[PDB]
Structure formats: C-alpha cells, structure tokens
Amino acid sequence: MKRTYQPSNRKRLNKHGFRSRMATANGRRVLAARRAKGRAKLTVSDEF
Amino acid sequence: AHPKRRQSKTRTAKRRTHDKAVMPTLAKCPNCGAWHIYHTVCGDCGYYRGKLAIEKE
Amino acid sequence: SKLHIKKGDTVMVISGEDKGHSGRVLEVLVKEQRAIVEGLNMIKKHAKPSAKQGGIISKEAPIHISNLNVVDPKTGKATRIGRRLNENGKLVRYAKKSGEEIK
Amino acid sequence: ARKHNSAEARKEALKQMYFAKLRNVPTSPRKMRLVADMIRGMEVNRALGVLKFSNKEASARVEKLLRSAVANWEEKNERKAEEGELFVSRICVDGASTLKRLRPAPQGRGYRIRKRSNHVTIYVDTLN
Amino acid sequence: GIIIKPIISEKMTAVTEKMSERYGFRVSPNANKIEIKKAVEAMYNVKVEDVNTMRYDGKRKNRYTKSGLIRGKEASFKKAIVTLKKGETIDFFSN
RNA sequence: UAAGGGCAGACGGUGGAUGCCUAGGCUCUCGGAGGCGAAGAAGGACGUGAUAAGCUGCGAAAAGCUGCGGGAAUCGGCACAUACGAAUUGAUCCGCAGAUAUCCGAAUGGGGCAACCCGUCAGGCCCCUGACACAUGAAUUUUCAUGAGCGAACGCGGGGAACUGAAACAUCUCAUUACCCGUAGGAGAAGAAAACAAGUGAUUCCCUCAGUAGUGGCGAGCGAACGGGGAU
RNA sequence: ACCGUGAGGGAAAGGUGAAAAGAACCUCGAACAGAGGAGUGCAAUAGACCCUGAACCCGUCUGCCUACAAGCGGUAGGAGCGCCAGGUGUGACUGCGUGCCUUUUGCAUAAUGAACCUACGAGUUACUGUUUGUGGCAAGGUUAAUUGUUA
RNA sequence: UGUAGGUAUAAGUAACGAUAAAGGGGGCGAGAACCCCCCUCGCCGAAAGACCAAGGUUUCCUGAUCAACGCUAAUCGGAUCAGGGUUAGUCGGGGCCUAAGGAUAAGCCGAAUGGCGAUCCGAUGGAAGAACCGGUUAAUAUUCCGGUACUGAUAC
RNA sequence: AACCGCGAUCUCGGUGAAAUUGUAGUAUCGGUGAAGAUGCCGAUUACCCGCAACGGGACGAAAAGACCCCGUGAACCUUU
Ligand SMILES: [K+]
Ligand SMILES: [K+]
Ligand SMILES: [K+]
Ligand SMILES: [K+]
Ligand SMILES: [K+]
Ligand SMILES: [K+]
Ligand SMILES: [K+]
Ligand SMILES: [Mg+2]
Ligand SMILES: [Mg+2]
Ligand SMILES: [Mg+2]
Ligand SMILES: [Mg+2]
Ligand SMILES: [Mg+2]
Ligand SMILES: [Mg+2]
Ligand SMILES: [Mg+2]
Ligand SMILES: [Mg+2]
Ligand SMILES: [Mg+2]
Ligand SMILES: [Mg+2]
Ligand SMILES: [Mg+2]
Ligand SMILES: [Mg+2]
Ligand SMILES: [Mg+2]
Ligand SMILES: [Mg+2]
Ligand SMILES: [Mg+2]
Ligand SMILES: [Mg+2]
Ligand SMILES: [Mg+2]
Ligand SMILES: [Mg+2]
Ligand SMILES: [Mg+2]
Ligand SMILES: [Mg+2]
Ligand SMILES: [Mg+2]
Ligand SMILES: [Mg+2]
Ligand SMILES: [Mg+2]
Ligand SMILES: [Mg+2]
Ligand SMILES: [Mg+2]
Ligand SMILES: [Mg+2]
Ligand SMILES: [Mg+2]
Ligand SMILES: [Mg+2]
Ligand SMILES: [Mg+2]
Ligand SMILES: [Mg+2]
Ligand SMILES: [Mg+2]
Ligand SMILES: [Mg+2]
Ligand SMILES: [Mg+2]
Ligand SMILES: [Mg+2]
Ligand SMILES: [Mg+2]
Ligand SMILES: [Mg+2]
Ligand SMILES: [Mg+2]
Ligand SMILES: [Mg+2]
Ligand SMILES: [Mg+2]
Ligand code: NA
Ligand code: NA
Ligand code: NA
Ligand code: NA
Ligand code: NA
Ligand code: NA
C-alpha cells in the first residue's frame, strides 16, 4: 500500500530548508532554539 | 494455549531424559585396521566386502 | 618546566631495583617524566621475525625521573642540584653537596 | 609474596593434568552437551571413531579438541600414547557469551534472537 | 597550483600506451578546462590540444575506534585527461 | 539396577553486583568583566599533514608566517605509528604586537532549493581567469557618520491565558504569573514635595511597624502606610 | 547514535600492568578458531571484553537417598549409610500443616498482584504558630538589620 | 499490571516469507545440496525481457577476508578492508521566457510580531544554436578512437 | 460419505523465537468452604520417563468491563 512518506527533494527543501526557515520570524525562532540546544543538523539542508 | 506456570528445573530435566545423540554403527575392517560404518564402503582403502569398489589414484 | 636532568648527564638511581647504579642518560620523555639510562632497567622483548629474524631483545626501559639524581663531580655521589647565574650571567646547574658546576 | 606462592602451587599442580579447552564456540551449548554425554568415559580411539562418524555437527569440533588433548598428554608425559591406553576421563560443556539479534514479527513487533556459544573442556588419562 | 597529482593506474597506462599524447591528472574540483590547460602548459612547457574532465565525489569511509564506528569521508576531486599536440610528451619518472 | 531425579560439598561457566579509584558533575564565595558585528558576527560548508582524516588547530601564506620579551634541549597536537627532518648561529614552548584569513550566513551587485547561478562599470591579462566598486533605511553635503544581525541573566515597556482555590460556580483567586513581542545599560528604573502627617523633610534597599489599618459572594483570600533602627 | 515530514524527542558506553616489559619459540589444528607449553611480569585464574569478580541462571565430580507412590514441599520426631571426635552430609519411616501481599463483615480462594536475581524506588526541607523535654537569665527576658577589631 | 541491566520458562518447540523444480558430470577447496564450467530438466516471455524519470548514493569492477551481516552451510554475496572506475561545442540540465503561486515598489491597513498590494522569482509548459556509422574496457561511451558531418562566436 | 494429488503435518541434519510464568513431587469422588476445590476432610485409585492426537477443567491467555451505578470527574451536542 501507499505509505505516508513519498520523497521529493524539491518539496523537502521548499518546506523545511534553510531559506524557508530564514524567511519567517518563527522559523528564525526554530533556528535559534536548535543552535542553543547545539544540534549538529540545523535544518534538512545540512543532510546528505 | 498458555503455560499457567513456568516449569521447574526438575520437570524440564525429566522431559529431557530421552534426548540423546545416537551412536554410529561402526565396524572395524581388520585388514585396514581402522573404523568405518557397517554396510558402507570403507572410505580410506575404497574396499567393500574385500573387493575394491572405489579406486582412488 | 625545566627538568633537573638532561641528555648526556650522569645520573644515579636512588630508588627501585637498580638502586645504587649510575649511568648515562640517553633520552628524556618529558610528557611521561621518564628517562632512559644506559645499561639499566633492561627488559626482554619478544620481537616477531617481521623486522625491517625476531628473537628476544634486551633493551633499556625508561625510569621515572624522580628516581634519578645527578652524580656529584667531586665525590661521585647522588645529590640534589640547584641553579645560579655564576656563569657570566647565564643560569647553570650546580651540586648542593659540594658547589661545583654540573657539566 | 602471597600471590607468587599461590601461583607457584597452582603451576606445580597443573603439571599432572592433561587437558584441552575450546573457548567461545559459536553454537548451542545444549546440542554440544549431547555429544559430550555420548563420549564421556570412553576410550580415546573409539571416541575418535565415534566423533568422526557421528551425525551431529558439533562432533567435528569435539574431535579436534580431543586430538589436541591427546597431544597435550603426549607432550607432558614425553612419550607417545599406546593403543587403548588413554580414555576420556572428564568432559564438560559450559555456556558462553550470547549475541543478541532482532527479528521482525507481524504487526510491527520485534522479537529477540539469541545466538549462543559454549566452552568445552576435555581431560584425558590412563585406564589405571 | 590546481594540479594535485597525476593518475597512475592500469587504465591510464593503457591509454598512454595506445595514444602517447594523453596523460591524466588529479586537479582541484573548481578549476575549469581553460585553467587546467594553462596550468599544464606553464608547468610542462607543452602545447595542450584538448582537456576532458570528470568530477568525483569522495568515497564515504568508516573510521574504526576502540569503542566502535564513526562515519567519515574522503575529499572530492576532479580528473583531467589532457591530450597534447602530436609528437609532444611529458615525463613523470624523470625528476 | 539407577533411565533419569532430589539434597549437600567442592570446583568451574555466565553475568557484572560490591569494594576501592577518578576532575566529570553539583552548590557556592571573592575579585573582575559584562558584549560580538558592514574593518562582515554568532553559527556552519569545504579544504589543509609524508602517508585516509574521527577530533583539535589553521585558511590557497592553510597542525601554520613575522617581530620584541622570557626560557634552554628537545621538538614535529590527540585517537597505545613509524619514518623523515628542525634545533645551542638557541628549535619546540610561553607573554605581547602584527601578517594571511576560501565559500555561506544580517549577507548588502541581481537572483537562489544556505555553502550556488547570473551580472554591470572601470582597470590588468587571453572563449577564460585577479584585484575594485555596485543593497536598503533614517541623519549630513555627491561626501560623511550611524543603523540592521546574534547573544546568559538582571531593567523598562506593549499585549496577556488557563488548569487551580473558593470542597459546585459566575464576582473574586490562580496572576498584573506562563507565554508572545519591542527596546537599554553596566546596571536599569526612581529621585529633589502642588509630600507625608496632625512634627518630619529627594529617591533606592534592609530590619521592624504588622498579618496591624483596611479590603473582600465581608467567602476563599488579599494586604498597606505613618513612625523607629540601619546601608548610602 | 537512533527515532520523527517537521517542530521535536533522545540513549548506552570509565578501570591490564609500576613499566607494554602486550606472550620470541615449540605442540595439536586448514587456520591462533581455540588451547597446552615456554618466556615477561610480584601476579597471566593481571592475556587485551584484561582490578575485585556476588546473585539469578548453567554444568562436572564426590557422598547419601530414590522406579507401590498422591496435596503450599516445610516443621517436629527418627533408623541406616558416609565423612572428619562429638561434630557434619543424607534421610527409610511416623505426626502436624490449604504460600504471601492487598482489600474486606468475611479470602486456600475460582477477588487483586508479582517470571527470577542484582541495582533503583516513596513523610523531606524552609518559614510561621502551638505543645512539650532540657537549659540561660529572672521582675524582667531578648536583640533584628547593621557596625568595629582580626579574620 | 513499579524502572534498568542480566538470565530463565514455554523449547530444541513455532518458524526458515508465495507448491516455477530440479538431476548429473567435472573444477577449486581443509571443508561443497547451495560456489565456478558443461549437459539435461523446468518457469516468465505486453515479462519475471529492454529503456527514461523520481528516489537511493559507490551498492559498479578487481584483489584479499568469512569474525559479524545472509533466517542453513558457504570456497559465494548488494557483506568487511584496500585499490580502481563516470571523459560531451551537438545527449540531459542550466543559462532565456512566462503559469498557479510567492516576494516585493508606489501606496493601503494594523497594540507589537506584521497583513495586503503591479516589477521580479517560480516548470509540471514555451525557446533552446547544433549528427550518425563502426570499433574498443574488468568496470564509460551519441562523451574515447577511426570516418563522416553539422552548429556558434572570433582574427583576415 | 469414499478415494486421489501436491503444500503444511510426522522422523532426521542445520538455525532457532513468542504470548505466559508466586513456588510445586500439580489424580478421582462426594462432602466442606467468600455459598461451583489438583492443593481442606473421609475414602478411592495410582510403578519411573517420553511421543502422537483432542480440547472437559485449570472460574485457561489477552485488554485496571464499553453494560450498570458512583465522582459536588471530563468532553462534545441541544434549548423558550
Ligand atoms: K562533463
Ligand atoms: K591485576
Ligand atoms: K592495582
Ligand atoms: K565467577
Ligand atoms: K516432608
Ligand atoms: K476479576
Ligand atoms: K495484571
Ligand atoms: Mg524429547
Ligand atoms: Mg552459531
Ligand atoms: Mg553431519
Ligand atoms: Mg511494516
Ligand atoms: Mg546425582
Ligand atoms: Mg561461582
Ligand atoms: Mg592568499
Ligand atoms: Mg539578496
Ligand atoms: Mg472550585
Ligand atoms: Mg577462520
Ligand atoms: Mg585470581
Ligand atoms: Mg577480572
Ligand atoms: Mg498397592
Ligand atoms: Mg520402592
Ligand atoms: Mg464483598
Ligand atoms: Mg479460611
Ligand atoms: Mg481492584
Ligand atoms: Mg498475574
Ligand atoms: Mg492469587
Ligand atoms: Mg514479588
Ligand atoms: Mg520486581
Ligand atoms: Mg501483564
Ligand atoms: Mg509444546
Ligand atoms: Mg511466521
Ligand atoms: Mg514446522
Ligand atoms: Mg522488467
Ligand atoms: Mg558486484
Ligand atoms: Mg574474491
Ligand atoms: Mg550463517
Ligand atoms: Mg565488494
Ligand atoms: Mg521573469
Ligand atoms: Mg554498463
Ligand atoms: Mg506438531
Ligand atoms: Mg529439527
Ligand atoms: Mg463442591
Ligand atoms: Mg473435588
Ligand atoms: Mg488454583
Ligand atoms: Mg480469563
Ligand atoms: Mg475497572
Ligand atoms: Na542421577
Ligand atoms: Na550578493
Ligand atoms: Na598462546
Ligand atoms: Na505477570
Ligand atoms: Na530510469
Ligand atoms: Na539521481
């Protein structure tokens, strides 16, 4: 059967990418919280 | 369906009473002087009932 | 930190199995604070024939430097050393047992 | 000096024992124990034949362990063994470290799989 | 400065045996064909006829420590296959 | 007769409890300091070693370059390495001052799916590369100066719940709390009487006054001030 | 690390030895797969998962008992046998005996709960009252904030 | 119905994942039902053959290795380690254009954070400036080579 | 209802889980009893240990009954 995750790199970057996060005040809030926690993977842009 | 209780060591061992490895049926073949399975070809010399059955070069 | 011994110095072992024996310093391991004294603390190493034919090799193992004392040039005895600027404005090592400059 | 004296006593004692050990054999201790119980107390040459022709898989490793024990006896006694002279005087199988694995089960459940190992010890001696 | 090392391999040896004007280099990943041609010409005093390039991503590798495993990676590079003019040559063994 | 079994002792197996140990935490004290950033930050990407780099350092000058001072024999970072070199004509190392410092990121030449794509004008080379400049907004008269973004707590300001308590619940409480947002400084706020009182004499903080006066479905609860003693 | 599209959630994991002196060489074996030796070392039953090395759990050996016997498995008697000088192992045979916790008027209960072991796990502290034991002063008792000296 | 770790019991039990199917002879090897070669047999064949895209990311080829992984063993492997391997003026994309939508200018609205709002961004569409034939590797080919051509800029 | 074929099944070699589990040397009958007993009482029957087969009991397993009532529990829906 069809499962919930149907991968698309363009959609992944458009939805959760670094520039998508920086475009909004709440996205920058997410980035600041992740930096404060010390995540090695800031966004899905860091992954490969 | 389900065990009401775990089995004790005694009960388990009593069931395992009849678990045993089987001894092979071994003949001596007094000529070659070494063991082989009764009613099989003697794998070293290749003989069987005093006749060369398998010749190995 | 500057150590109280150095390569080329004659030292006396004052503690351990080789206590009472003198020798020459061949190398100093500063981080571990140890030194190789020639002829002392011999060990047998089982060396494979890899090399480059193996065998049992006798060689010196290092000693802790707090077990080594400089030999006094006058009386040939272990002694604590000090430092003074008597040599033309340069600091030199000298033996507190006698006073002669260590060299 | 205490531990040196204890070790010297044990080292002297070991000179009169003739044994071999297999450690960390990656197989079931129970299945190995079946073979051990089959050959316990048996003369060494018959035991070698039995292990060579046995229908269990573990007998192949037991045979090489037995050969090693006979060689240890021969070295410690400084002579070759004769015919029918040696017998399997002791044998034991112990459990050893287990590898833990995961196997998927229906409806998203995961079950644990144990891959067991054993040790085997064999002592030989003369039928005195 | 962009040329890192030459390519010595069975494929390169066969290519040079069959052509004798064709050589291979490992260069910086961000150098273009004109830059590679100029660097090779300046380094070896020859006339370069053609340059072929392919970009290689570094291999992912496993670094083994006492505890266990760490995932690591090798550096990415670019392969430059350089063909010279007829009769020209470059020596890698000499000097 | 023990196929097997029961109990005890001895000796092993497994497993990793216990004891002993540790600079890794926790709570504080004292003294400083209280920012970083368009001269490009925080945080990253990619590189960089004789040999693959996991960390560390560093940036195409890439485990490093220069000077001054200190010091005097080893040094070439760590993950149980060797080789090969440096160094008494003073290495390595330490303090201070300098040089270099790729790409992304406020990112600022225009775009963009971060670490990429595409340009314009002048200048030096020969399709293509190396050094400039090229954003916006409030001041200033094209020039000049500032700003933007990030970041611990403490300050001020703009908005502002509910569960809960009242043994239900709506006034009330929780609470001018949580939380969101804006914006300073080493502190901030307050502060020099159109004041308190029935003599004192600007603010702020501490101990009392005092769970007092009051307030309140006068329920649950909430709760001062004058005066006095101090810090200043 | 792993899990999640994402916001986010979020582990386990310390100890050879004083010093690597980290086991040359021999034997069995295709192989160190593993072991027996030799050698190093105070010690290798400190041999790399390495200090100590418990329980549950799993084995081997030795002693005694056991194939006419029926219920919480113990407890109180009591031969014989076996070890080492009046102790210790076993237990022919006999009497008595429906675990434990919790919740209940009342539970062997066919009410609840636990596979077992090791480790972890639940009336604490602050302030303010009140009573009391014991004290210091006493018609009086007591300082708070703070200040001085040396610390 | 407490938590972590370890170890039991059920138990050598359920099960080893489509009933398309296997047999023999040689080879190598310490070890072979399963690996390699040959013969025979069987299954798919609008596929269970051959390609493009998404997605994955070295799984590709070779040499060593058989501890772990592979529901058995293994000399084998999409496994471990090391080395090698992807070649374009013409193929695909990008560079150019715009759709939905998004970000904005002048302006509008609004405690704050901000919400709107015609040029720019944005393919799943429109342009691209432009070939085939043959051969060759262990692993690439319209890319390498031999022919045959064509296209765009540039100096006479 | 009978018979037939293959897969599962059974036996052997290899690998090897789970639910469940206070400890158990865990028989029957009638009594007794928190009122339906392997475990209590009195009788009766029964040499020790497996394998195949079936499901009567272990108020068998599983999910702190959804029915019912209770809590000055909750949510959602309606309305003069
Ligand atoms: K290319
Ligand atoms: K030890
Ligand atoms: K110790
Ligand atoms: K133990
Ligand atoms: K009894
Ligand atoms: K019940
Ligand atoms: K329960
Ligand atoms: Mg059986
Ligand atoms: Mg196994
Ligand atoms: Mg077999
Ligand atoms: Mg699934
Ligand atoms: Mg017994
Ligand atoms: Mg023990
Ligand atoms: Mg530079
Ligand atoms: Mg921009
Ligand atoms: Mg209420
Ligand atoms: Mg092997
Ligand atoms: Mg010991
Ligand atoms: Mg130990
Ligand atoms: Mg009878
Ligand atoms: Mg009897
Ligand atoms: Mg009741
Ligand atoms: Mg009762
Ligand atoms: Mg209940
Ligand atoms: Mg239960
Ligand atoms: Mg119960
Ligand atoms: Mg319990
Ligand atoms: Mg428990
Ligand atoms: Mg349960
Ligand atoms: Mg069963
Ligand atoms: Mg299944
Ligand atoms: Mg089956
Ligand atoms: Mg197909
Ligand atoms: Mg392959
Ligand atoms: Mg191979
Ligand atoms: Mg396997
Ligand atoms: Mg491979
Ligand atoms: Mg456009
Ligand atoms: Mg191919
Ligand atoms: Mg069955
Ligand atoms: Mg079987
Ligand atoms: Mg009844
Ligand atoms: Mg009954
Ligand atoms: Mg019952
Ligand atoms: Mg039930
Ligand atoms: Mg209930
Ligand atoms: Na027995
Ligand atoms: Na830019
Ligand atoms: Na050994
Ligand atoms: Na349970
Ligand atoms: Na495709
Ligand atoms: Na792809």
Indicate the topology.
The structure is cut from a larger assembly and holds chains A (48 residues), B (57 residues), C (103 residues), D (128 residues) and E (95 residues).
Chain C: E1 10-13, E2 22-29, E3 34-37, E4 42-47, E5 55-60, E6 63-64, E7 68-71, E8 78-79, E9 81-87, E10 90-95
Chain D: H1 2-14, E1 19-25, H2 29-39, H3 44-53, H4 59-77, E2 86-95, E3 99-104, E4 110-115, E5 118-126
Antiparallel strand pairs in D: 1-5, 2-5, 3-4
Helix pairs in contact in D: 3-4
Chain E: E1 3-6, H1 10-19, E2 22-27, H2 33-44, E3 48-56, E4 60-64, E5 69-73, E6 77-84
Antiparallel strand pairs in E: 1-2, 2-6, 3-6, 4-5
One magnesium ion binds next to loops of chain D.
The structure holds four RNA strands.
Radius of gyration of chain C: 16 Å
How is the biggest beta sheet of chain B arranged? 2 strands, antiparallel
Number of strands of chain C: 10
- Element-by-element helix/strand order of chain B: HEEEE
- How many individual helices of chain B? 1
**What is the share of helical residues of chain B?**
10-25%
Our count of helices of chain C gives 0
What kind of assembly state do the chains in view correspond to? part of a larger assembly
**Ends apart, CA distance between termini of chain C:** 20 Å
Spatially, the strands of the biggest sheet of chain C line up as 6-3-2-1-7-8
Order of helices and strands of chain C: EEEEEEEEEE
Strand order of the largest sheet of chain B: 1-2
Provide structural commentary.
The structure is cut from a larger assembly and holds chains A (48 residues), B (57 residues), C (103 residues), D (128 residues) and E (95 residues). Chain A has 48 residues and is an all-alpha fold. Chain A has 3 helices and no strands. In chain A, 54% of the residues lie in helices and 0% in strands. In chain B, strand 1 and strand 2 form a beta hairpin. By secondary structure, chain B is α+β, with helices and mostly antiparallel strands. Chain B is rod-shaped and about 65 Å long. Chain C has 103 residues and is mainly beta. In chain C, strands 6-3-2-1-7-8 form a 6-stranded antiparallel β-sheet, with no helix packed on it. A two-stranded antiparallel ribbon of chain C has the order 4-5. Chain C has a two-stranded antiparallel sheet with strand order 9-10. In chain C, strand 4 and strand 5 form a beta hairpin. By secondary structure, chain D is an alpha+beta fold. Chain D has a 3-stranded antiparallel β-sheet with strand order 1-5-2. A two-stranded antiparallel ribbon of chain D has the order 3-4. In chain D, a hairpin with a 5-residue loop joins strand 3 and strand 4. Chains in contact: B-D. Bound molecules: potassium ion (K) (7 copies), magnesium ion (39 copies) and sodium ion (NA) (6 copies). Chain D binds 4 RNA strands through helix 1, strand 1, helix 2, helix 4 and strand 2. Chain C: This is Large ribosomal subunit protein uL24. Chain C: One of two assembly initiator proteins, it binds directly to the 5'-end of the 23S rRNA, where it nucleates assembly of the 50S subunit. One of the proteins that surrounds the polypeptide exit tunnel on the outside of the subunit.
